[PDB]
Design a protein around this ligand. Structure first.
Ligand SMILES: Nc1ccn([C@@H]2O[C@H](COP(=O)(O)O)[C@@H](O)[C@H]2O)c(=O)n1
Ligand SMILES: Nc1ccn([C@@H]2O[C@H](COP(=O)(O)O)[C@@H](O)[C@H]2O)c(=O)n1
Ligand SMILES: Nc1ccn([C@@H]2O[C@H](COP(=O)(O)O)[C@@H](O)[C@H]2O)c(=O)n1
Ligand SMILES: [Mg+2]
Ligand SMILES: [Mg+2]
Ligand SMILES: [Mg+2]
Lengths: 158, 158, 158
């Protein structure tokens, strides 16, 4: 028994905020805006996992209206989600993720995001892939108004 | 033994159309524009299903020019597609879907969508997940010009 | 055992380039811009396959700045990627792909695309699905500024 999940998220890039993607703080002059730390990649990972076990989405579990979510660490949120997945009787098969951003260049941070995600999913780094693509200056990600992310996850009984 | 499918669709939001998403009519002052009822989520689910079995996309079976597509009920189209899947030997593993819309708030209608999708795929509600995200006012969805959806499906022999 | 991968890519449409998609030259008045042939779909497929086995993305294996990338045949880049996948001990389960493009109409070239991708992944055509959608004239794909593609792949031990 295998189950699939998919996640998609978008956050605005703005002046007065830290950039945290995949649990890793990137030195940058813009960061992501949200109620929590706005880590678009960990929200997308969390969404894919919840999706795979039929448990809705991060908004159902950590709504904005509740200020426990306010400035929440999304790695801790992911850990809570992974708790739900474990309770269903699953472990990670593998995950594959895409950061969609014109800038910054994510390549130097990728290996540390893979480790961090793997730690949050209680898995080996070889089960976690993270990649990045621009949109060649097209669309809202192309004009650097925001950063999007996608993930697909395969989980299995264990 | 297993196959994966992925679907993506976009419809314009316009005055004077009903809003039908996931087979559920949602009261709102705009609806989706199409030749059919323009149920962007059911079109996405149908496309993921057809994708999983190597049968093309909804346009190969129900082109815009087919008089049957005009005002077609997308749930019925989904049933037709699911008959194709079943003839190939497959049943639903699980499906995970995302509505990409700035508004309306999808949350109250999610559980009815899940039940309707599950009925179309002859499956338990536990096998179906639907979630929603905005794009934080960015891009065409952020301007409420349209609604998009994505789905990933895992099917298995049965 | 099974592994999942997901790809996404975008290239700009510009005058005075061939349009090559899914390894097929499509006669058209614009083509895709890149250092390589800029085949957005074969890039997307390659990234999905690399993702499935935890090997990063095409830029970690075939960076922009590599002279062999300049005017590269993306079918040959796919065959190399597929080499890596086989080296890790996997074969194709199935793959589902979507071209996102306002124009041209892809339908006539879809069957030749499927055969080419199946050849690239050492698979039967029945394991490969290629679809197209527009975005109803919305966003960068809808204004014909570029073409995007998505792919989800399921690979299996063999
Ligand atoms: N159109 C929408 C968009 C989001 N939602 C829900 O609201 C939450 C907040 O969405 P955003 O994070 O995109 O603002 C989501 O996690 C989802 O639970 C909704 O119910 N309808
Ligand atoms: N924001 C980004 C975008 C792309 N990249 C890298 O650059 C490579 C090529 O990306 P583009 O072709 O999208 O520009 C990617 O495969 C990825 O390795 C990155 O490291 N950070
Ligand atoms: N560029 C495109 C876009 C769509 N199509 C086909 O047209 C059909 C309908 O596309 P839209 O509803 O996205 O316009 C699709 O289901 C696909 O069969 C195509 O052949 N080439
Ligand atoms: Mg988020
Ligand atoms: Mg549609
Ligand atoms: Mg490319």
């Amino acid at each position: 028994m295998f189950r699939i999940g998919q996640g998609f998220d978008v956050h605005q890039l703005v002046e007065g905020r830290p950039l945290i993607i995949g649990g890793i703080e990137i030195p940058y002059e813009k960061g992501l805006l949200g109620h929590s730390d706005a880590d678009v990649l960990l929200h997308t990972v969390a969404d894919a996992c919840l999706g795979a076990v039929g448990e809705g989405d991060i908004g159902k579990h950590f709504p904005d209206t509740d200020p426990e979510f306010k400035d929440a660490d999304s790695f801790k949120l992911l850990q809570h989600v992974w708790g739900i997945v474990k309770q269903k009787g699953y472990v990670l098969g593998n995950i594959d993720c895409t950061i969609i951003a014109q800038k910054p260049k994510m390549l130097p941070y990728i290996e540390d995001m893979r480790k961090r995600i793997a730690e949050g999913l209680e898995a080996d780094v070889s089960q976690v892939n993270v990649k990045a693509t621009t949109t060649e200056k097209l669309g809202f990600t192309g004009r650097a108004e925001g950063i999007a992310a996608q993930a697909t996850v395969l989980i299995q009984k264990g």
